[PDB]
Design a protein around this ligand. Structure first.
Ligand SMILES: CCCCCCCCCCCCCCCCCC(=O)OC[C@H](COP(=O)([O-])OCC(O)COP(=O)([O-])OC[C@@H](COC(=O)CCCCCCCCCCCCCCCCC)OC(=O)CCCCCCCCCCCCCCCCC)OC(=O)CCCCCCCCCCCCCCCCC
Ligand SMILES: CCCCCCCCCCCCCCCCCC(=O)OC[C@H](COP(=O)([O-])OCC(O)COP(=O)([O-])OC[C@@H](COC(=O)CCCCCCCCCCCCCCCCC)OC(=O)CCCCCCCCCCCCCCCCC)OC(=O)CCCCCCCCCCCCCCCCC
Ligand SMILES: CCCCCCCCCCCCCCCCCC(=O)OC[C@H](COP(=O)([O-])OCC(O)COP(=O)([O-])OC[C@@H](COC(=O)CCCCCCCCCCCCCCCCC)OC(=O)CCCCCCCCCCCCCCCCC)OC(=O)CCCCCCCCCCCCCCCCC
Ligand SMILES: CCCCCCCCCCCCCCCCCC(=O)OC[C@H](COP(=O)([O-])OCC[N+](C)(C)C)OC(=O)CCCCCCCCCCCCCCCCC
Ligand SMILES: *Cc1cc2c(cc1C)nc1c(=O)[nH]c(=O)nc-1n2C[C@H](O)[C@H](O)[C@H](O)COP(=O)(O)OP(=O)(O)OC[C@H]1O[C@@H](n2cnc3c(N)ncnc32)[C@H](O)[C@@H]1O
Ligand SMILES: COC1=C(OC)C(=O)C(C/C=C(\C)CC/C=C(\C)CC/C=C(\C)CC/C=C(\C)CC/C=C(\C)CC/C=C(\C)CC/C=C(\C)CCC=C(C)C)=C(C)C1=O
Ligand SMILES: CCCCCCCCCCCCCCCCCC(=O)OC[C@H](COP(=O)(O)OCCN)OC(=O)CCCCCCCCCCCCCCCCC
Ligand SMILES: CCCCCCCCCCCCCCCCCC(=O)OC[C@H](COP(=O)(O)OCCN)OC(=O)CCCCCCCCCCCCCCCCC
Ligand code: SF4
Ligand code: F3S
Ligand code: FES
Ligand SMILES: [Ca+2]
Ligand SMILES: [Ca+2]
Lengths: 59, 44, 285, 98, 43, 599
């Protein structure tokens, strides 16, 4: 059975002011939360790093 | 807040649709327990 | 006899995606034997064509150059001119011709709307693109599978239910002109689905979330004074994300060719649901 | 749980036809999912029959579970093995979901 | 309808969010090892 | 052989071929009666022509003014021009108040008078006290979109029950056995081309008219008279096909409608001189005269050289006299339609209008219980077993020679309910079926395949356009014998052409080209019958007006004209006659004697 397909609406709709206005707020909140979580993860990651070793050192 | 994160993941990710409301609630309970533990432990 | 095909399918999918991005908006000229001089006098329509019944067919734009001085100025008129004069295999739904049935809803050049009451850019330079409703499965050409829309419409019980017998049976359910005008601008929906196919929440969750049109119909049956199942309907639409998924984008009221305002109806429904949830606690005590 | 079985089948189809699915796009339904659909619909029809003494339960089972059967019906073309796969569904349920 | 000590609940939730964010991000307890090259010296 | 087409067999207690107002009413009425019913339609119910109906539902509720259903009966009889069966008119008129109240009970939103009762407005051809009581306001209208609201309410009620809808199935033919009974129907699923032989006892054949047989017609693109063509191809007769009612007002050059109720609100008809001329043609009711007389007056004024617009081809419908509040409250939809299809702002400009083909008083004959009838070879009429025409497709004679106006929805509802009641009366739910005939659908599949793979010389559109032009030129408001004979010759030639059509799509999924070809065949049959019946009748009655015979002859031509198309391949049309009914169903109302006024 050949599965049916469709043309995604957002690929063929003229850009509108409503999309912009609403997705702007959604992206603002997404950016805020992502920035907070990424800052936490960045602090964790950098603090996880090892200490600098000597030159040509084994173990 | 937690509710909103779950709602966004459900509405945008097709795979996340697999989870029941019961599994979501279990994640909610575990997250609340972990948050309480974090708050308590940081001060110890 | 068959074997695992995860790798072949994956490679084919990636390669096809890349190629389609390179060759997006594939176009085939209906009549290549046209002198570029002639095309100065004719407008170009790019019509989406796809016949899943034929195993060898794939989606594609077809270019038709037509003289716009031979038929009236509407999308449906141009589509039917192309069908009758150029290629009568084109498929589209059409009943009313005056924007009442709502069958001809299509993506008329970037905007979902009824093709029978929508004009097209008269300029001969900019091409016009006619495609089916976006997020609906395509059956053939400009004909989509609106079955799910109707199935959702059925779930709202769109029939007057009354819990109190009529006092005399020789009269009509009383309703003052105010309780009637409360429905004005709300019962004119023709179930064209043009709005709901433009709602992003309906793009993401077609099944769990009822469309703006169906929810507007539920609101119409709720605000109606003659029906007595107000709270029951409110509770029924309050399940999971049948209504909560609406994000008040407002595109529904912008696309509605009938001029209706489903966004306002959904806002009122949300307010009524919130009040219902609160007073299920406040009242019963 | 039976409802979630049907919804799992539908979710697999939807992930198949998702626009973001640039990596696992399949033109023709494979045999395994076809067999799963056929057996799931068979069990659903048997369940509907077993609830003949409870009109409300039968109606709820239809409206709830058969919804995803109808969506699966809409997800695929009417060729190949389609007449045989949806033979039982075409009797009554298909007409209900129109 | 009335909620006993609603204001206390609001402030407790706000305090919990603030404390959790403070400890998770360590927003206030930055690192200045990156600024040392850009700093003057005494003695 | 044609076994290559997949065939699936069903079994139902009753079928309803159509999903208009009549189809839905009959379907859910049958479901109420307890019969396992099915409904077959090529369109989603809410997209049938009933949705486009603007004027109200005509009924004798005494809300706006004192009314008595006997007055409505008299108005209907006079409007029919004494060619409609008295019994059916009596039944419909008597049932109208109950039908409208039941519609309201379903939840149909009607415009409300300040007291809360259903609102009503004047319409063309209404009166009180048997014509001497002045204008009558009995048309209960739901704003200017009554058809839409009525159809949606009926569809909602249908969904309330289980009607086993067959959405977007095209009915090809009727399964009839050698005894003349309608065993069932043979239809095709436009989705995937499956063929279904639905067996059933009774088949309510209500599938609209053939308004699309003309060039300019207000009828929807899907009004191709399939209901009237299935019967014809099955050998049953077609009754009163020559009478075609032209709605007086129709947007010029587009075919869209201007609700007659507008002229009931205070609209005016104006010629180039700038005057209301309908007084000379209807001094008593003025604009609100019978649709036929208004159309004839407009046509005469056009032919008198007083054409209102450029190239003097139409008439001005003035509406800016009314207050803008009234226009926006009672005529919103038509105002918008005028703005769109004419670019004329109704509030301060006059619309262009011209009489346009609107309604088909013809259809499959019935008795009044909605049972198809056919003349036995003796000449006496007999009831066709298991076949119940209803709606516009049924020539129950309730409209006679000229539909009164706003009575079509009333007819739909009343006679759909009547058909359901009759099925309840005769059939029993628990009746086993006998097997279908040996040759269930050989001819249906034969025609389907013949049109599917046709490789003739003329395209479907060319033939359809030729037929429409011929009908427009020769079956216009005024008929004359020489012109009608020329039209008959042209239609015979076009029919000869149709045997060599060309089709460009050989597929099955939504093969709209094949659907349009089949509808073209149906319209050709209907057009041939219509033109011949018009040619034979030598009089000027109702909507059938002839320049050669300007006087109606009750002595000779007070009889329905039945048309037969036997041996479709031959395409030769015969005509016989069936006497009118002058006996009411009861002694409550005395039958109206044939008068000599018709306004
Ligand atoms: C598409 C390809 C793209 C490729 C990209 C490749 C990028 C490679 C990056 C490599 C690593 C860079 C690390 C920089 C560290 C900076 C801090 C620092 O120096 O710390 C010193 C660091 C110690 O860190 P620390 O002090 O403990 O804590 C650091 C914290 O950041 C805390 O320090 P802080 O407290 O000072 O923090 C400052 C504060 C500052 O915050 C603020 O105040 C924010 C201010 C923002 C202002 C922005 C203005 C922009 C203007 C816009 C205008 C628009 C106008 C439009 C108009 C339109 C019309 C109207 O917070 C932040 O900086 C916020 C950071 C959190 C980020 C949140 C988002 C995360 C997710 C998203 C990531 C990006 C995705 C992009 C996807 C793109 C897709 C197309 O130690 C060092 O000396 C290390 C130096 C850095 C090198 C590390 C090397 C590690 C190597 C690992 C191996 C693998 C490498 C792989 C490389 C691959 C390459 C391809
Ligand atoms: C350094 C520290 C360590 C870092 C690594 C830590 C890893 C921890 C464990 C992570 C476990 C992840 C898996 C479990 C979660 C649920 C997954 C799931 O739904 O399973 C089924 C689902 C598959 O469903 P399906 O039915 O096969 O797909 C069809 C459905 O319609 C699909 O429907 P759908 O909506 O469900 O599918 C969306 C799907 C996404 O899946 C997809 O459908 C597509 C995935 C590939 C997209 C690739 C990009 C496409 C083009 C976009 C434009 C890019 C432009 C770049 C250039 C710009 C130049 C200016 O979303 C997810 O996968 C959800 C979770 C995603 C975030 C967590 C994973 C992060 C992995 C980051 C590393 C990846 C490897 C290295 C890559 C770089 C090497 C140089 O996911 C998978 O099985 C795949 C999992 C992801 C694999 C990696 C793909 C790349 C992702 C990159 C994200 C980068 C974000 C930015 C921050 C990164 C910071 C590190
Ligand atoms: C196998 C079993 C199953 C396992 C499943 C897997 C997961 C594990 C499950 C285990 C079961 C327990 C899980 C933890 C509880 C989860 C609760 C939850 O999710 O609730 C959500 C739910 C969320 O609701 P919501 O609507 O979002 O509203 C939340 C708002 O925050 C609204 O909050 P609120 O407004 O209602 O406030 C809450 C209330 C709660 O607080 C209380 O009332 C409790 C107080 C503490 C009691 C602690 C008792 C501990 C006893 C331990 C005994 C030993 C145990 C040893 C066991 C050994 C093993 C046998 O807060 C306060 O009372 C605020 C006090 C503030 C004091 C301020 C001081 C002011 C000083 C200055 C005075 C004035 C000076 C003036 C000077 C003027 C100068 C000018 O929370 C609540 O509503 C309840 C409140 C929150 C309770 C949190 C409790 C956390 C406990 C964690 C214990 C971890 C123990 C680990 C042991 C490990 C051993 C190895
Ligand atoms: C360490 C690893 C880091 C890697 C970084 C990778 C970054 C990935 C960023 C992804 C952004 C989001 C899109 C993908 C994920 C979508 C998930 C989702 O829910 O979507 C589902 C939906 C699709 O599904 P759907 O529309 O079918 O919705 C589901 C509907 N049902 C359930 C009915 C099936 O949305 C999409 O996937 C939209 C895809 C849009 C793709 C846009 C591509 C833009 C490319 C721009 C290139 C610019 C190049 C410039 C070069 C300049 C040179 C000079
Ligand atoms: C065209 C028109 C008619 C009209 C009107 C305005 C316009 C523009 N205004 C009216 C008014 O104000 N008052 C009134 O009384 N009548 C008015 N009319 C006329 C009236 O509405 C119609 O005559 C009547 O409503 C039509 O009823 P009916 O149900 O018989 O016709 P239909 O609605 O078109 O129904 C046809 C159904 O059958 C299906 N169909 C058609 N062909 C087939 C085949 N071959 N197989 C299967 N199904 C078929 C159609 O899809 C439809 O469902
Ligand atoms: C709110 O409700 C809604 C929805 O939800 C239901 C929707 O789904 C939708 C529709 C949703 C969709 C179409 C979703 C699918 C499409 C998607 C996700 C496409 C969008 C993708 C993204 C936003 C992610 C990719 C973008 C990024 C990672 C951003 C990266 C930004 C960067 C790097 C910043 C670039 C700029 C700079 C560096 C600044 C340079 C200049 C300077 C520094 C200035 C110089 C300064 C000095 C000091 C000199 C709508 C409209 C909606 O309204
Ligand atoms: C938005 C949605 C997604 C969000 C995701 C969020 C994720 C949160 C994760 C939380 C946990 C964080 C853990 C951080 C661990 C970091 C380890 C690391 O790589 O550190 C760098 C390390 C060298 O560091 P160090 O030894 O300290 O030296 C510098 C000292 N001054 O580097 C090394 O030593 C290098 C060797 C180790 C790293 C190997 C990595 C292998 C990756 C294999 C990928 C395979 C898949 C490829 C796919 C594409 C194929 C075409
Ligand atoms: C594709 C990728 C998919 C990824 C999916 C990932 C899903 C992850 C989901 C889990 C993580 C969610 C994190 C949410 C942010 C953290 C918020 C937080 O810290 O609070 C958690 C919760 C309250 O927040 P929330 O429930 O969300 O909102 C309630 C609104 N009324 O707080 C709680 O309920 C915790 C319990 C304590 C609450 C505070 C109690 C009062 C505070 C004072 C306590 C006093 C104790 C005694 C005295 C001590 C001091 C003297
Ligand atoms: S909601 Fe608007 S766009 Fe959708 S069917 Fe109703 S009128 Fe048309
Ligand atoms: S466009 Fe979309 S999500 Fe809500 S209000 Fe309007 S519907
Ligand atoms: S063509 Fe009639 S409403 Fe679209
Ligand atoms: Ca109510
Ligand atoms: Ca008729």
């Amino acid at each position: 059975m050949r599965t049916k397909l469709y043309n995604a609406a957002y690929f063929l709709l003229n850009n509108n002011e409503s999309f912009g206005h609403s997705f702007g707020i959604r992206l603002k909140i997404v950016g805020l939360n992502t920035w907070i979580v990424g800052y936490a993860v960045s602090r964790y990651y950098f603090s996880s790093l090892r200490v600098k070793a000597a030159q040509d050192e084994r173990f | 807040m937690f509710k909103e994160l779950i709602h966004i993941f459900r509405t945008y990710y097709i795979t996340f649709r697999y989870l029941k409301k019961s599994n979501i609630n279990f994640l909610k309970n575990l997250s609340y327990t972990l948050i309480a533990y974090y708050l308590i432990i940081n001060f110890q | 006899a068959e074997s695992n095909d995860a790798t072949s399918i994956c490679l084919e999918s990636i390669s096809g995606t890349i190629k389609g991005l390179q060759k997006a908006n594939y176009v085939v000229e209906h009549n290549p034997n046209l002198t570029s001089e002639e095309k100065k006098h004719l407008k170009q329509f790019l019509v989406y064509r796809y016949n899943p019944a034929d195993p060898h067919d794939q989606p594609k734009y077809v270019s038709y150059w037509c003289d716009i001085k031979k038929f009236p100025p509407m999308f449906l008129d141009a589509i039917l001119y192309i069908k009758n004069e150029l290629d009568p295999t084109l498929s589209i739904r059409r009943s009313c011709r005056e924007g009442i049935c709502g069958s001809c809803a299509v993506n008329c050049d970037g905007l979902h709307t009824l093709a029978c009451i929508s004009g097209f850019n008269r300029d001969l330079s900019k091409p016009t693109i006619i495609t089916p409703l976006g997020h609906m499965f395509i059956l053939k050409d400009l004909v989509v599978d609106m079955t799910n829309f109707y199935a959702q419409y059925k779930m709202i019980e769109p029939y007057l239910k009354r819990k109190t017998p009529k006092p005399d049976a020789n009269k009509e359910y009383p309703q003052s002109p105010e309780q009637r005008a409360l429905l004005d601008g709300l019962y004119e929906c023709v179930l064209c689905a043009a709005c709901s196919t433009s709602c992003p929440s309906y793009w993401w969750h077609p099944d769990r979330y009822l469309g703006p049109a169906i929810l507007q119909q539920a609101y119409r049956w709720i605000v109606d004074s003659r029906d007595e199942y107000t709270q029951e309907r409110i509770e029924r639409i309050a399940e999971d994300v049948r209504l909560d998924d609406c994000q008040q984008i407002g595109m529904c009221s912008f696309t509605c060719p009938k001029g209706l305002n489903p966004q306002l109806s959904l806002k009122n429904l949300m307010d009524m649901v919130k009040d219902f949830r609160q007073k299920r606690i406040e009242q019963e005590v | 749980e039976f409802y979630w079985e049907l919804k799992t089948i539908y979710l697999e189809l939807s992930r198949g036809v998702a626009t973001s699915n640039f990596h696992n796009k399949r033109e023709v339904t494979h045999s395994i999912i076809e067999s799963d659909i056929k057996n799931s619909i068979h069990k659903y029809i048997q369940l509907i029959d077993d609830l003949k003494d409870y009109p409300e339960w039968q109606h709820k089972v239809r409206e709830e579970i058969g919804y995803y059967a109808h969506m699966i019906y809409t997800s695929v073309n009417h060729d190949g093995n389609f007449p045989e796969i949806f033979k039982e569904f075409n009797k009554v349920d298909s007409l209900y979901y129109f | 309808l009335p909620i006993r000590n609603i204001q206390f609940a609001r402030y407790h939730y706000l305090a919990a969010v603030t404390v959790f964010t403070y400890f998770a991000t360590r927003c206030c307890l930055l690192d200045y090892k990156k600024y040392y090259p850009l700093a003057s010296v005494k003695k | 052989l044609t076994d290559k087409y997949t065939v699936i067999d069903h079994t139902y207690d009753a079928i309803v071929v159509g999903a208009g107002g009549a189809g839905l009413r009959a379907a859910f009425g049958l479901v109420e009666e307890g019969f396992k019913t099915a409904c077959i339609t090529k369109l989603f119910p809410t997209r049938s022509h009933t949705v486009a109906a603007q004027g109200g539902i005509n009924a004798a509720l005494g809300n706006m003014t004192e009314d008595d259903w006997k007055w409505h009966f008299y108005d209907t009889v006079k409007g029919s021009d004494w060619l409609g069966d008295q019994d059916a008119i009596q039944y419909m008129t008597r049932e109208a108040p109950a039908a409208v109240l039941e519609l309201e009970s379903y939840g149909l939103p009607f415009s409300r008078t300040p007291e809360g009762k259903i609102y009503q407005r004047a319409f063309g051809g209404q009166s009180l006290k048997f014509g001497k009581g002045g204008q009558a306001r009995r048309t209960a209208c739901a704003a200017d979109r009554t058809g839409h609201a009525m159809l949606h309410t009926l569809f909602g009620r249908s969904l309330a029950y289980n009607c086993n809808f067959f959405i977007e199935y095209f009915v090809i033919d009727l399964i009839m056995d050698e005894e003349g009974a309608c065993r069932g129907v043979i239809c095709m699923s436009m989705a995937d081309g499956s063929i279904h032989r639905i067996r059933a006892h009774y088949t309510v054949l209500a599938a609209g008219g053939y308004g699309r047989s003309y060039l300019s017609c207000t009828a929807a693109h899907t009004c191709t008279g399939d209901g009237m063509a299935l019967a014809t191809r099955a050998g049953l007769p077609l009754e009163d096909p020559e009478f075609v009612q032209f709605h007086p007002t129709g947007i010029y050059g587009s075919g869209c409608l201007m609700t007659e109720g507008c002229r009931g609100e205070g609209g005016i008809l104006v010629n180039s001189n700038g005057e209301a001329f309908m007084e000379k043609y209807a001094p008593t009711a003025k604009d609100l005269a019978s649709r036929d007389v208004v159309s004839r007056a407009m046509t005469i004024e056009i032919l008198e050289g007083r054409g209102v617009g450029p190239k003097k081809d139409h008439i001005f419908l003035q509406l800016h006299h009314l207050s803008p509040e009234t226009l926006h409250q009672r005529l919103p939809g038509i105002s918008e339609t005028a703005r769109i299809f004419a670019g004329v702002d109704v509030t301060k400009e006059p619309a262009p209008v011209v009489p346009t083909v609107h309604y088909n008083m013809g259809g499959v004959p019935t008795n009044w219980k909605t049972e198809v009838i056919t003349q036995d070879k003796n000449g006496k009429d007999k009831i066709v077993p298991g076949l119940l025409a209803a709606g516009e497709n049924a020539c129950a004679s309730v409209h006679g020679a000229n539909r009164l106006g706003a009575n079509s929805l009333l007819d739909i509802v009343v006679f759909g309910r009547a058909a359901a009641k009759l099925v309840k009366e005769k059939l029993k739910p628990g009746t086993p079926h006998k097997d279908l005939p040996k040759n269930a659908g050989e001819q249906a599949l034969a025609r389907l395949d013949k049109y599917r793979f046709a490789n003739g010389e003329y395209t479907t559109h060319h033939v359809r356009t030729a037929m429409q032009e011929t009908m427009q030129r020769h079956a216009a408001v005024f008929r004359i014998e020489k012109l009608m004979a020329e039209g008959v010759q042209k239609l015979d030639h076009i029919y000869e052409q149709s045997k060599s059509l060309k089709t460009f799509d050989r597929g099955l999924v939504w093969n709209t080209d094949l659907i349009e070809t089949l509808e073209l065949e149906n319209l050709l049959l209907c057009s041939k019958q219509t033109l011949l019946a018009g040619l034979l009748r030598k009089e000027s009655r109702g909507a059938h007006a002839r320049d050669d015979f300007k006087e109606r002859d009750d002595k000779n031509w007070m009889k329905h004209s039945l048309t037969w198309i036997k041996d479709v391949n031959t395409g030769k049309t015969e005509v016989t006659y069936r006497d009118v009914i002058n006996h009411t169903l009861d002694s409550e109302v005395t039958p109206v004697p044939p008068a000599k006024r018709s306004y």
